[PDB]
Design a protein around this nucleic acid. Structure first.
Lengths: 415, 421, 52
RNA sequence: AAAAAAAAAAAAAAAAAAAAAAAAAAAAAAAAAAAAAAAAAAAAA
């Protein structure tokens, strides 16, 4: 099939179609360029000052990102945090035995010239400062990324978090529109700050100010949905990462799995940079994204859904994937895991179930090959019970959002 | 399966995935550091005073936790309480024979410098003091932890409790939001106080002021839900702790059970510190929590639910657990316990049911097992091609149909959907 | 014609006025457009649902 | 009389799409919208 030809007149034709570039970009394969995550923050000038440029700047539609940036640098040099262990990543040392370090031993710079208010926007603001203001500011990263009454859900609670040994009201005017400060997202250095705040308090989980991760948290594995629906599939099938992996039954799902699992990227690593590849700008097209792993994302979720997952219910149904092979392979894996439970006596009193005491009855366990065999044995077309299993998984599901694998499954199966 | 490889091009791949730290932390394995539960209470200055700093501080959005803390220390030195028995825990002596002791023989300190009002908030408040004000204050720990019209339920009654023998009325303004004083929770020393008040009155259950446990009670086994749904499963299957244990049929449920049952932690102990591991800060990630025991929590409740438990109805359905093996193993245990009751003559008059009659019969086959032995049932289940039977799934659908008012994301709502249709 | 080409002019044949009747259009490829979408639709396509 | 898509200028074609996205998932701790104790027919001269 490298070479197609029309039959009646017997002329060639080259079916070609619009290319589709943007390769992925891995964390590691970027520290092969630079060894530092440059955080340009400019006005290393007064903090007492900057604290004001932002309190006032926020109670109105205009506060410069460049200012909030610099404000955060100011509030966040709680050089607190004693590395009880070591800490490196991708070559980058960060601190060895017990070394005392702060949120920014992740390589600071300083940039350009333009900055708004003069000397003092107002003397009002005391150091009811770090206490919350940064929290609140970082928390707007989280709010900015969203779109439905979750925005007001997210703000309204990402605003009872500054009522924590503070007390207060709530600032800035317009609800949302992904517009009011949803631009901070677009700011290379802002993202770098939240990414650092999280990566830091992620490490020093017990810190007093660790409460700050409230908004800074949606940064960890930002754009790594498929990576995370992998881990969820595993957890929801109770199966091991490797055994789940064998259950991948489509070239372009395995292609993506291969792309995700690429080594020396610190995926699995305790406290690595990788989770923040996107916000630290180590990558501008993450290889763990739903969108670069559409087939994997669909399958893994559809499967988990069938296996009673609450999450998957609402996972988006990626477009331009082969739906009618991904679902089949999902159904099967779901069926396998589903029908044939994992029951096994765990405790006893000298007495336990030594277990080694029909035609076409589904396979004993969860071996891919046992099941593939069984399926081929099924003329390669999903069986009545399994399709019933599927219809039992999805009927009774209500409140399904359009274009989710949830709504997909229910339509594919309940009728 | 340590080593996976792609087939067509035959290259390796290492399926790895984001790690997941926060280990648990046990009570015991903390007194291997310190032998004291340090209650930093700073302003050991006047009480008549502090009683005011809080009465007024509360009738308004601003009262310092540091103040309530110190106020409680003041009101709660009812050094009352005669240890009729002994009393130790984790090495810590607390009082031997006849020893007379009070709520704070649990190791007090004193801290920093900042404190709000000057000399006198207002001379108003008499010693209509301990009588309730502490109760009320402690009661707000309980209220703070919550989220639905239970808040107003909980306050509205955790406020007819100060109308007791004292008859003194309701206070601050805003309903809730987990915000108004729901921050006292975050206070290391506050929690330590309520934890001590409970642990104490828990011991001296008959004390006059024991009425104080009203709010201080949600502290005992705070973050130990799986531990408690274990006990409930037991109670609800009438089975013994050990026989219930054998009925655990999933690696990760047993792993959790093992983690829970870890010895020398005083779980089972009369009046131990363990129940308060969280609030005394003996632990910052309790090993008895629903969340560190997700599979155990699910199973145990789902099962209990099936066995008619009223509680389980509303237990949350933990995420990222294997739902379709936990339910199977739950259904099975439920079925076992359910179908085959526990009937046996208990009393008589010289005449009783000798039960071993020549047990030869007709249902010569596949009828579910006589009793509740795991192995008898496992066998039977394997005998069932390892797929839950019609009656047992009917038993399940009888358990859950007719259940109404099920909350979303509870094992209740789960079971009804899994079974009623 | 550089259809498949990375960054070619072809995608803009219309707007660059390189063409005033594009050979890739639904309208000059009515049968192909129908078939391909109808098919895709059957194969669960979300897009095709709304193709004219 | 003349007519006959309440067709149509073309060009057109997802009431698709900036990029990045992807549970309208999440500080963490939790987890019966259980629970002072005592009780518990919203039973009773």
């Amino acid at each position: 099939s490298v070479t197609v030809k029309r039959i009646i007149d017997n002329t060639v034709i080259v079916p070609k179609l619009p290319a589709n570039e943007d390769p992925v970009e891995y964390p590691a394969d970027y520290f092969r360029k630079s060894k530092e995550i440059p955080l340009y923050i400019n006005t290393t000038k007064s903090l007492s000052d900057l604290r004001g440029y932002v309190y006032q700047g926020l109670k109105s539609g205009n506060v410069s990102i460049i200012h909030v940036n610099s404000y955060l640098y100011g509030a966040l040099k709680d050089i607190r945090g004693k590395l009880d262990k070591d800490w490196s990543s991708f070559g980058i040392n960060i601190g060895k035995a017990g070394d005392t370090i702060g949120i920014f031993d992740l390589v600071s710079l300083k940039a350009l010239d333009g900055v708004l208010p003069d000397g003092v926007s107002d003397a009002s603001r005391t150091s009811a400062d770090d206490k919350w203001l940064p929290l609140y500011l970082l928390g707007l990263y989280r709010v900015g990324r969203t779109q439905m009454p979750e925005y007001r859900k997210k703000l309204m609670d990402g605003l009872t978090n500054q009522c924590k040994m503070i007390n207060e009201q709530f600032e800035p005017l317009v609800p949302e529109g992904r517009d009011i400060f949803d631009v901070w997202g677009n700011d290379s250095n802002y993202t770098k700050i939240v990414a650092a705040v999280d990566m830091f308090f992620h490490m020093f989980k017990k810190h007093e100010c660790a409460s700050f991760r409230y908004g800074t948290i949606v940064s960890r594995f930002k754009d790594c949905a498929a990576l995370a629906t992998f881990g969820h599939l595993c957890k929801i099938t109770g199966m091991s990462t490797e055994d789940v992996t064998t259950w991948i039954l489509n070239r372009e799902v395995a292609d993506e799995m291969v792309q995700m699992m690429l080594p020396g990227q610190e995926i699995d690593k305790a406290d690595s940079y990788m989770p923040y590849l996107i916000d630290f700008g180590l990558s501008s097209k993450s290889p763990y994204s739903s969108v670069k792993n559409p087939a994997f994302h669909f399958w893994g979720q559809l499967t988990a859904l069938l296996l009673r997952s609450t999450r998957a219910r609402n996972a988006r149904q990626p477009d331009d994937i082969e739906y009618t092979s991904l679902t089949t392979a999902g159904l099967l894996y779901a069926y396998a895991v589903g029908s044939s439970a994992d029951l096994a006596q765990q405790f006893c009193v000298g007495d336990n179930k030594y277990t080694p005491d029909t035609t076409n009855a589904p396979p004993q366990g969860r071996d891919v090959v046992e099941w593939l065999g069984w399926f081929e044995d099924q003329n390669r077309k999903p069986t009545p019970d399994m399709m019933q299993y599927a219809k039992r998984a999805v009927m009774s599901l209500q409140g399904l959002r359009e274009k989710t694998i949830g709504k997909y499954a229910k339509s594919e199966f309940d009728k």
